[PDB]
Amino acid sequence: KLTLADWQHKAASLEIEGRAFIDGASRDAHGGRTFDCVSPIDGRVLAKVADCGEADVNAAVAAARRAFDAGVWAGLNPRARKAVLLRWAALMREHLDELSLLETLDAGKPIGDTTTVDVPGAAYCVEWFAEAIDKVGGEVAPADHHLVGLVTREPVGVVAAVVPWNFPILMAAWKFGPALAAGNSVVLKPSEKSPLTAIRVAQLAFEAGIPAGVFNVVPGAGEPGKLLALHRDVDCIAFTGSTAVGKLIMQYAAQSNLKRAWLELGGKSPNIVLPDCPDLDRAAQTAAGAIFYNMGEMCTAGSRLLVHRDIKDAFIEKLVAAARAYVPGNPLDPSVSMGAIVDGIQLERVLGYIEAGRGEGRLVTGGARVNAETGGFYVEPTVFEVKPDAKIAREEIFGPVLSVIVFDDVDEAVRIANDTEYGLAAAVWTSNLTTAHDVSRRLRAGTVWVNCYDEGGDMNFPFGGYKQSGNGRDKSLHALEKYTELKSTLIRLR
């Protein structure tokens, strides 16, 4: 483990690449356009980064189209594509310190987190899809004997991925890992709030043997994301972000060329703690992690803690104690568990919910902006006790603000849990076999954790929304359906 001083010294010597990566090479944006890539830690300008517009999106899409239709990557045998993707992941791992530091500088995420969750998660995602390429195939149908009936999957062609700033490298890889394994060309549009790791891994991709045009990164703001959703030559768009943008993406997809559109959106995920919870200390610590990890900037954040009246007093005590480890600090410091909020606008939005919370609920802990003098954006881990219809209980805050909701019986907790337009995740804590399975079946969410929350990172578990928390799944073999088409081939022999 490197020390704070070690990370600070590396940050001082770090050469940061800000150019787009398009068709096998770094490029400035057309006409010399840039934006300032600012660090949430302290407001320092890290780099000028390409600000792409239509000329650049069009160049990226054309190169992707050219490379797909030429079969430079789709036409490789399964084992050969697996070998390239493994090499890229190995490279990510070889450059883990650099990539981790870029992520922590760019997005304010603790270095203890980026070195262990974000960069290894990205590399694992790429490796797992690489390793799956040559293990699973299509079907020979049980059809009439005069036919040879085959059902196969083929890459869709050109895939656009627009990803958010809360997990820049990790969400990026959840898109490009499966899309590339399937043989697609990819145009990735990282958030203007976190372009750097995307850019960096693009360079490593080409170094590993991903052909020119197969993996392109187009930094910029809203416009290049629009243009990719509208593009006549993009076959699929995969987005993780907010709902207004998500609803916009689906609309331009349909209105243009009916490109496949796949969204992973926000949540107001409920975390239900029952009296027979096997370990109330682990549950309280995990309830804190569920909402304060990555500064609450987690679509699956456990932002509604539903707790049974019988254990509520003791549980809230343990929660408050747990919240202490998440006092904000410099994310370059490896001992820090809560880093910086991504920018002032996000900070202000979070403080606005904290203000609503003060009026409608009981403040249990936290609630203040801190370290304003650093030039960065920091807010204490904050807990309120509220009714389930409170503003902060209903609306996604995307910050370290927990809504604690009391209930008297399990069916009530289930009713409150499901009373939302969101459906990304849920959890229940209970020692009882029947309760565990019965409640887990009834929670209307894509991921249900039992006696855990945000547990591990296993690629076998598809991840995504019911209702308005997105369509389709990331992770697992089911992720590949978003980036392939089915084909039935009926071969008549006589």
Added chain:
Amino acid sequence: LTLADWQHKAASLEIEGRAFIDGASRDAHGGRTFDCVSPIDGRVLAKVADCGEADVNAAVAAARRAFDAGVWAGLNPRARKAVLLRWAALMREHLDELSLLETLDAGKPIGDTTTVDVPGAAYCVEWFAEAIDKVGGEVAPADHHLVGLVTREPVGVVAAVVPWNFPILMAAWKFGPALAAGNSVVLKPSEKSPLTAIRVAQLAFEAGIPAGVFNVVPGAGEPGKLLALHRDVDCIAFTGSTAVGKLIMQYAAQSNLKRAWLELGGKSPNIVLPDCPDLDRAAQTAAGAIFYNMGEMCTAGSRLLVHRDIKDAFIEKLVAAARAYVPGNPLDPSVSMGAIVDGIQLERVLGYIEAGRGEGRLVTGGARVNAETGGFYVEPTVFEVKPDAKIAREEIFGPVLSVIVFDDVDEAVRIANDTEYGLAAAVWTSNLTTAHDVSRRLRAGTVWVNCYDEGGDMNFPFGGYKQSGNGRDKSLHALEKYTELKSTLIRLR
């Protein structure tokens, strides 16, 4: 049964035109109806409930109530299987009635409705019913401190908006899997073909599909748009034109992000090479591929790509094959070519025929016939054209073939794939490597080799690449449109 027999049965038929909502035949709220007109002769068959906002809301509310009570979703897999099999068995018991309704309503030959449409609907239901208790979820190879499950659950309330070219068959393609998975369904059949949907809704209730769980709301574009926009619908499945599909996707997105699954148009290429195994079967099948169901088929083999070396002899054979498709009364069991659905649709087809006269070579057909009947009939029509011709590019949805010559396989594949459609394609060749190589290169959901529109097997997912739709009907893959995946991570220690 003879033509006279079917006319007699038609005269004796008591036709139900009301909606079927929440266990009951109901007029539209406020009592409005539209006239259901037969394309055979323009005769009014029935006055059909012309449903609007209040009806849509009542159907959706009952579907929601039923789903939440678990009257259907809460039945064991074998118990839902039994009810669905009983419903298909009632369909088969009522096969003459259903087949006659479909022929009267949509102008489809009784020789087809009795053998393709109605049995095809039953089969779909029966196949999904039989699959319910055969396939499950996953136990993940997860770390040992976890029990990791991956399961599928019904989405809840499913709306299904279906077209008039195969009314009962396409309806079943939606409701068979959606109901097997446990969802409540609200079906909005085309205003051009409401009758069989209404009749199966009554049979559904009779078989034991609980009130609320299967509803039919007749009417035109408005209730379909309202279902697409509805706050309490979870999923909408649509089959129709690409242009209307685009609106459906926008309605879903704008409202509640309901899942939207479309099956859309096509301009499917049917490629015939010199080493085709049997040129006479190929020619007969090529005609069937564009004249079956009056060419009102999304997968119609509407571009016949033929190699220059066999083109002359092939066209001669095709013209001979066209003779079987003389327009006639679809109540006649010897008729293969029935009526176009209405006069607006007929005029669209005749506008494309007129376009083709101007840009290519008329080979055979091209005329509207038998106008004196009050019905809508057009000859089986063949043009030779270049691939950039309007009739070669645009979906006609009538019995109009574009014959396009090519010089080598690579050119055939380029021409085949140079379209925004992607529903189906075919190639005819005796060569092993050619059959597999070409079939891989064709960008379409279904590729037929040495066949076209072959059988109806439920194991083959069916749907679009590109602008011909997203997702698949038929096959276990159809169930994915009507369920959500859930990952359950149970931590033991």
Added chain:
Amino acid sequence: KLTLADWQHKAASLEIEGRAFIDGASRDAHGGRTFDCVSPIDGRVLAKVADCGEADVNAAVAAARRAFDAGVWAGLNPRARKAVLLRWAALMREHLDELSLLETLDAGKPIGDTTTVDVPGAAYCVEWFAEAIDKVGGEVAPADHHLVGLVTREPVGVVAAVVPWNFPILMAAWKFGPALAAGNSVVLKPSEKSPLTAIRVAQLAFEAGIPAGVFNVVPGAGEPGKLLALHRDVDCIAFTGSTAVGKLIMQYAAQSNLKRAWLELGGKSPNIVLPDCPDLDRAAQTAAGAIFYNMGEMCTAGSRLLVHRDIKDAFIEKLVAAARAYVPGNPLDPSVSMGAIVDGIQLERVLGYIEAGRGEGRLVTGGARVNAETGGFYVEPTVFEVKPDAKIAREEIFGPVLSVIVFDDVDEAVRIANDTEYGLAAAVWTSNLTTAHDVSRRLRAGTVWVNCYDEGGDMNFPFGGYKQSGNGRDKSLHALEKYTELKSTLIRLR
């Protein structure tokens, strides 16, 4: 519902078919061999049944081999085979009273059981496999692109099935249902102790449209089973029965022509009851049913009840109370829950084990032969408290004799459970989520029941042995692997 009197009037009027069914028609055995088919209810001779030997076995195998190699059944399309199988199952249901009565008379099984479990189960098995035929397929391998790689399953050819007398029609169907669905021809050799339902369903099969030679039934004792295991033209033998006979079958299979051999053998299945069991009363009732259902003539009988010391006394009281429902009685009486032991030799074997129990443990209830004046064979439901090492606790009895073993902790109960050469099934009763999953994972047995025992009869669950309780599985899609071969076809395009 038919009364005892109705079943009696029906039995007096019944015309019982005793001929073999070979190559599409009933046949006497070569040279007019028969045995007397005796009823265990009262020793009445029911019918004279063909006693097949070498000429009959060879006729049946030759007809099966002809029909398979001609493709009369294997060459039908999936849907066509499905319809025929479904029709046969429908005929079984149309004749449910007849087949249920045959079974009750032939093997002494309660009519309330044969009408509700045995015959519906046989029909459901056939139906489930018929329905599965056109739903699952082979593979298109993710192979190098110059190949089309297919992985398919093909019927093995001629399948011999040798089945026991404890569940005559049900175990027969568990073999023939999947074997026939896959397209094989079958030569079924039912127990000399229970030939009649097998014979009857062969006629129904032919009426349904199963072609001549595709389903054959050859009644007789051990000789035709020996011949089938040794036959040079049989490709597969599936057996259910005793271990020593299974060992003979496996040896004869190997030495003759390496025909596939698949065995379902006996058990000494442990049923573990912990203090946090959700419902001690249901646990006790189900423990009684686990050992007294079908006279304990059940390979999966819950014949070792492991109970925690803290609840042992209370549990044993409830067990004795539950045992009262299984007083032996006339199986033709629909109110009877436990019928006759199959024959005197079996009865004396069970009484021998009971004497052994008296020598090494404590008799809790039962213990005695009853109703000897009937000419039938009956023994009370019997319970002993014994040490885990006891003779009755180690060896399979195949009668209504329960070994109750105390334990002091869950690890001990797992060690006792697994300390056997058997591994057919096990069960644990606990309300705790972790215990349930942890214990069910550690139990070395093919079926594990949690908070139930011998629960329902769902076809999705493979059923069979670890260790010496057999190889391979009956029920589920996995049962098809016993009757098919894999083929990889590698098609090189260039």
Added chain:
Amino acid sequence: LTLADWQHKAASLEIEGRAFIDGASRDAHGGRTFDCVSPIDGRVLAKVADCGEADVNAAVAAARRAFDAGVWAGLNPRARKAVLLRWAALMREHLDELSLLETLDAGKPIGDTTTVDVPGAAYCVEWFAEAIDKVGGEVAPADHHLVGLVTREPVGVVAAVVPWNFPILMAAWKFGPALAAGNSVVLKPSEKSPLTAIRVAQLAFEAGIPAGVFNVVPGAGEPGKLLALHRDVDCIAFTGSTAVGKLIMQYAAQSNLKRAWLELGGKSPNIVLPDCPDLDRAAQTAAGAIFYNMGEMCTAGSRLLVHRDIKDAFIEKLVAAARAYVPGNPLDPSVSMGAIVDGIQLERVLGYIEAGRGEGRLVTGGARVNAETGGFYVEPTVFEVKPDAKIAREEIFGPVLSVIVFDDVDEAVRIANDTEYGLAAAVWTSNLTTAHDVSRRLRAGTVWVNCYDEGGDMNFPFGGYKQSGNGRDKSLHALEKYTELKSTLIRLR
């Protein structure tokens, strides 16, 4: 590397002869050894542990203890994957050493062991390790009061007895999947090829496979018998002759009913039809099918069935293609056919060649060569025979081809299937229907079309119909041999 380089490596090579049991290299009971003799020139390479009952027992006990302690089975899937990947990477690091051991021990051309055997071993290990965290069990579509799981668990202690024609490769085909699934393995390699098995066991331990999880017990038939009869082995996987396999099954039956999975001999037909796309490739591949690895291949294309119309010409191309397999020193990288494993095997092959002279027509080869080297070599040999010839019926396990004429495709299929074997088959044809219809009709585990022994892809289950074995090596299907199914029915209410 050149001939000289391999020569220098061999002279310097240190060869380990001890057993590897319970994480240590150990002498056999009583210090007993046997001499490991190279078939290249008859030089003694090493004295190798000659294991008996005490050693078999120490290995099985160590495997049992490790399995019970869960030092390997209780690791998470990703953790087992990591160790197995490390081991395969160590094999590849040590490729030169391992290839040279295989060549010296079993006489296999160094050009083969370096490109096929050692990389195939590593790839098999890799592929199964990469698979362990991708595929899982089932959540059954059961009644709702139940949670029904269907999982797979490791069987426990797996014994593996493998032959001498592909020592490291067939060892790996067993231990790759068996270890991936969590089992402990006791490997008993052939007394004619102990060396790579021993070395890979050391490397396994190096890479982190725990003590007692992977053991190697060198020696002859007795230890293999002892493993098949062992009271505490749960499964035995055997590859070898059909006759010894029958014994393995009986040993399993008589003892503890352990699972027995056999990969046995063959007499595989290779059918060449007149419309073969490329007769020159087919002729050269036909030669490779029988002459590769000295014909010491269970899947050897040892019956070449050729249509009468192309027979003379095809035979002429076969004869040319044979010249490439002139026996040479296996340490020479330009050599394509090496040495027969020992004198007794050579005499067996020669006995068959003499049989052929009596019942057919000797086309080429026929002779023992290079006797002066002290090694065992025989020429690539071809006979024309009727299908009832002794050499056409019986497995020879040497470079001896039986060429059989046929007059039509039905006859070729009859002749191909008229054997008690069923390991593999092939057909060459350019016709789509012929290719699919013949491939379906051939009763063998692997059917090649327009190729033979094509690549080594791990996705294709390999193994016998009839008397060529039960079960399959390679693919996810290989795992079934080393796991049990469990149904867990969890009743909630």
